[PDB]
Paper text:
AP sites are then processed by apurinic/apyrimidinic endonuclease 1 (APE1), which cleaves the phosphodiester DNA backbone at the 5′ end of the AP site using its endonuclease activity. In the human APE1 substrate complex, N174 is within hydrogen bonding distance of N212 and the AP site bridging oxygen (O5) and deoxyribose sugar oxygen (O4).
The APE1N174A mutant had a kobs of 0.039 ± 0.003 s−1, corresponding to a 22,000-fold reduction in kobs compared to APE1WT. This substrate complex diffracted to 2.29 Å resolution in the P1 space group. In contrast, shifts to the DNA within the active site are observed, with the AP site, phosphate backbone, and surrounding DNA adopting a different position in the APE1N174A mutant compared to APE1WT. Specifically, the AP site phosphate group is shifted 1.1 Å out of the APE1 active site in the APE1N174A mutant compared to APE1WT. This shift increases the distance between the phosphate of the AP site and the nucleophilic water, ultimately resulting in misalignment of the phosphate backbone for attack by the nucleophilic water. Based on these results, we conclude that the N174A mutation compromises hydrogen bonding between residue 174 and O4 and O5 of the AP site. Therefore, in APE1WT, the hydrogen bonds between N174 and the AP site are necessary to position the phosphate backbone of the AP site within the APE1 active site to support nucleophilic attack during catalysis.
Residue numbers in the entry: 43 to 121, 127 to 147, 154 to 318
Write the structure that this text describes.
Amino acid sequence: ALYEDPPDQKTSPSGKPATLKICSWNVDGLRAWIKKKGLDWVKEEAPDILCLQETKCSENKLPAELQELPGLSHQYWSAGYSGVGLLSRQAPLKVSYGIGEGRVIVAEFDSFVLVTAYVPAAGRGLVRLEYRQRWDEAFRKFLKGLASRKPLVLCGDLNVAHEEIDLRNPKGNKKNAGFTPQERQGFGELLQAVPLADSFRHLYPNTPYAYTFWTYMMNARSKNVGWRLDYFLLSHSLLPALCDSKIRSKALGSDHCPITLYLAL
DNA sequence: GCTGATGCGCCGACGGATCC
DNA sequence: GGATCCGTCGGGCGCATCAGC
């Protein structure tokens, strides 16, 4: 079945208007994503904060169009395997890289700490599943020592469909990367240990067919055969500020679609 | 400097057993 | 004997590297 994303809710349950728009997008090759007009979609989206994953591009190789973004001038970049980026209208107080460089950017703002993550894939044949489980454990601990200080927002490709609702084909993908019990359990452990909450599922717990990733192969996107691998996870103190978590199914330029968070801060 | 090849990383389609 | 479940496998796309030239 096809998915139509509900309209943007820009008011919090407590009555507070949205003041912060965060966009997250695994661009699957920043240079290719730009040739596919992905920046033009970002300009239409007008995010205060843009988090990019799978850049596969060093900073010295970034197209000059990224430095021609007047509303996203504060740019933080890591480094054809991974690569993450954080672009912000306002300068964050503190920026760090890693979980204690290429998969994690931590940006501290006045009322919140933003973490963007390109979580390592378990691999075809699950060759890197054990490293992912150790990675998952290292990230969870690192995030626990960040949430204690200030509210946390975590965005990006977590390389996991938490539940059967997060993918079109749960039964045949239970031994595939993204739907292993090991990865699903790691996500549940991040939600309970930090603690954090799945923004989209908190808002839409019974909504199926909502995916953020489709294989370029076998025309998967045109058939909505996909997976929800991209998330906005929020500390429970920030749930009162949650106005919406959106899935931008129509934006192209990658096998991953953009996700957008509206916060009332 | 540029093009095309190859390598590497990153599951939906379909064939074949099997069992109500 | 057809629904279903598992196992097997070609393939889209980006980028690095290489070779040619």
